[PDB]
Amino acid sequence: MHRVMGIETEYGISVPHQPNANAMAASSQVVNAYAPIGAPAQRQARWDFEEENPLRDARGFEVARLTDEDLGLANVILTNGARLYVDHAHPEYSTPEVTNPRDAVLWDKAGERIMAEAARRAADLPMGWTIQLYKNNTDNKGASYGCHENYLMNRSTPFADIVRHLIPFFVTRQVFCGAGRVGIGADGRGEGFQLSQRADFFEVEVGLETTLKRPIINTRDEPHADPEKYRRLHVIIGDANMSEIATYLKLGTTALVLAMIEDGFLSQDFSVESPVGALRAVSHDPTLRYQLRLHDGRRLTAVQLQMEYLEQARKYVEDRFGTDVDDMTRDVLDRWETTLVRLADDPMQLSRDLDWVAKLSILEGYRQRENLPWSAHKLQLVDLQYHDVRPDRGLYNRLVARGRMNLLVDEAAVRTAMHEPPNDTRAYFRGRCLAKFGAEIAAASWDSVIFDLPGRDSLQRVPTLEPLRGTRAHVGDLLDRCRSATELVAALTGGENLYFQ
């Protein structure tokens, strides 16, 4: 599997003992508490959806003309290639560019560790606050926050085909991607458990908005790459996942569907009547019996429709690659199929793999011990605890501490990924430059690193416009042998020994 992708996760935030506490200021404290470990972001170090914050232009870039803390402007580039910032009045982590779902899992998991460490550091600074962070999507006050996925696609792929084949897939993906939620409806006052945190907050099929009138297919399309060649697919429908298996399947199955769409492989029409209604109805039935209504009149459970996408993906891979299928593609297909088979038989068999199942198992334990109905406030507390970033307080983290969840990566790899970038994207160059040459870097962003060389009047901008250049294979040996940023820049700007970047 090889496709540029990423995850941007907005974290829930709470400052105990401070009623109505300024979430913007708390979020700035979290980000600023980790700033010593990275470098300032340039003005353009922004995703398009950051337009929905104070004091920005149409691109999310800060404009001129209240303190910057109360405005949530803090924006830091990390040595692992990630970015840490404030969005929608919450701390947000954007992974480095990665090329496959296992690396997405790894650097996204490092983000949870970075958030936990940032909150710990914020408390230690003088006048600093004690701050709790949650990797979930709702605050139980009718508010929702986003876990965004980005996938780099060919600009020539017809958008109408992207929409028509992705909607039924996104309506049903929650059977394995959902994180679970206690309470039904946006206000959470309806009684019961549902598969997804986000489903109740969606209103339309296709649209540009992200923080209101939310669409199943968001149309923001601006890539961190040449827009003539590439489209960014920006997905906002998914819950933040704790389980590594859930995040892996979320990104990996979506990437396989995108490959089928780009190659024109799908001839079926999986269109669903009233997809927003179906999104909610699937979420609200954790017994997995609800049968969607397809436009052609077929009736299929969400699991059954996912199985139709799986069957197409297997045929696509067999026809395109034959017996030269790469290990990760084979693994995603096998885990997708096994998960769907087990979901149809007994979802509770998946408690080591899926967030909503692991969470439901904990909640049912409380219901059995204490004779609690679904409306009991304690169950909403337990729902939230599942997502706490602290290693001893988050319930997912306590399951992992006991070896009770399946993992794709080990903790030593997660710790390394807090500070070292992926090797196969431009995040390598960016992260390694910040680590080795940080003394001579003024700022960085997805598109360039800005060097300040002693004895040179002007700052030196090194562009990094292509996400698949500047990898370890391209520049690792050069970075190893250079002793200063002056030597590095002289090599990169030389016309005889060319570095294509």
Numbering used by the authors: 1 to 65, 73 to 508
Quote the study that presented this structure, word for word.
Pupylation is the post-translational modification of lysine side chains with prokaryotic ubiquitin-like protein (Pup) that targets proteins for proteasomal degradation in mycobacteria and other members of Actinobacteria. Depupylase Dop is structurally homologous to Pup ligase PafA, although the two evolutionarily related enzymes catalyze opposing reactions.
With the aim to capture Dop in a state where the Dop-loop could be resolved, crystallization experiments were carried out with AcelDop, exploring conditions with Dop alone and Dop in complex with Pup and/or different adenine nucleotides. We were successful in identifying crystallization conditions, where AcelDop in the absence of other ligands features the Dop-loop in a well-resolved conformation that is not induced via crystal contacts. In this structure, 33 of the 40 residues in the Dop-loop are resolved, including residues P40–R65 and L73–L80 and thereby all of the highly conserved residues in the loop. The Dop-loop features two very short helical stretches (DLη1 and DLα1) flanking a long zigzagging loop. Superimposition of the Dop-loop-inserted structure with any of the Pup-bound structures reveals dramatic conformational changes of the Dop-loop and several active site residues. The comparison shows that, upon binding of Pup, H95 swings upward by about 90° out of the way of Pup’s C-terminal residue and displaces the Dop-loop, including residue W47 that moves around 11 Å away from the NBP.
